[PDB]
């Protein structure tokens, strides 16, 4: 996250780290056995790490659980990043508690101007790399459709929205992929892509989760 702040340990209790011997993507716990993340985070050999703050130290409250299956949306397009959403089933259920908790799915889409919280262990630098130990947070508004499409002509589908700051300096970045955009208690977005990180006039682009709520529900009900 570029331009954000240290969240505070376990203050974002639905935030997950996907790990294969190192953190590679975030995700969101939506019930005790299922995580939503981005399709471009798909890999084999995923351990889901719950209740994390410092990802390099065992501090207490962590739960490490292997993925038993990862379900990439059948219409995921890796060239356009359209339908950039994946569901991960845990090998066993997480213990829910104050520090490990589900986030609610939306019942409607959010409006432009809605303020949201984005979080992750991704790169904190626009130019170089610096990966944090602890979880970073960024408050960001959802941008209007027309501003989003002006920023990225021809590249924004109805399953994408922009959020962040056109002046630059505040954005998600590499390694935040798959993580939550939460607006008034509901998971509205998944960190998907952007040009660079925190560049002027190039906001972050996020999978629009309200378009996927019945697919998520029907998929979980059959698996
Ligand atoms: C299709 C695509 C678009 C943009 C890039 S990127 O190197 O400019 N920017 C990266 C880094 C990134 C990741 C997540 C969010 C942002 C952001 N600027 N909000 C940026 C990207 O979009 N990624 C998502 C796709 C997989 C590689 C990582 C690379 C590939
Ligand atoms: Ca830890």
Curated annotation (Swiss-Prot):
Q: Where in the cell is it found?
A: Secreted, Extracellular space
Q: Which residues bind Ca(2+)?
A: 52, 54, 57, 62
One GO MF term attached to the UniProt entry: serine-type endopeptidase activity
Q: Which residues form the active site?
A: 40 (charge relay system), 84 (charge relay system), 177 (charge relay system)
The Peptidase S1 domain, residue ranges: 1-221
Return the cofactor note field. Binds 1 Ca(2+) ion per subunit.
Q: Which cofactor does it need?
A: Ca(2+)
Record PTM: Subsequent cleavage after Lys-125 leads to alpha-trypsin. Further cleavage after Lys-170 yields pseudotrypsin. A cleavage may also occur after Arg-99. Not sulfated on tyrosine residue(s).
Q: What family is it from?
A: Belongs to the peptidase S1 family.
Supply the name of the protein: Serine protease 1
Q: Which organism is it from?
A: Bos taurus
Gene name?
Answer: PRSS1
């Amino acid at each position: 996250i570029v331009g954000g702040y240290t969240c505070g340990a376990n203050t974002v209790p639905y935030q997950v780290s996907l790990n294969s011997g190192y953190h590679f993507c975030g995700g969101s716990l939506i019930n005790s056995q299922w995580v939503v993340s981005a399709a471009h985070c798909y890999k084999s050999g995923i351990q889901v790490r719950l209740g994390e703050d410092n990802i390099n130290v065992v501090e207490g409250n962590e739960q490490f659980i292997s993925a038993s299956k990862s379900i990439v949306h059948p219409s995921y397009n890796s060239n356009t990043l359209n339908n950039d959403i994946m569901l991960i089933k845990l090998k066993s259920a997480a213990s829910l508690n104050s520090r490990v908790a589900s986030i609610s799915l939306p019942t409607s889409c959010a409006s432009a101007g809605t303020q949201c919280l984005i979080s992750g262990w991704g790169n904190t630098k626009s130019s170089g790399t610096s990966y944090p130990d602890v979880l970073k947070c960024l408050k960001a508004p959802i941008l209007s459709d027309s501003s989003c499409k002006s920023a990225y002509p021809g590249q924004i589908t109805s399953n994408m929205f922009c959020a962040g700051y056109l002046e630059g300096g505040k954005d998600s970045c590499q390694g935040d992929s798959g993580g939550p955009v939460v607006c008034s208690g509901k998971l509205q977005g998944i960190v998907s892509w952007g040009s660079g990180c925190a560049q002027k006039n190039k906001p972050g682009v996020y999978t629009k989760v309200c378009n996927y709520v019945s697919w998520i529900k029907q998929t979980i009900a059959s698996n």
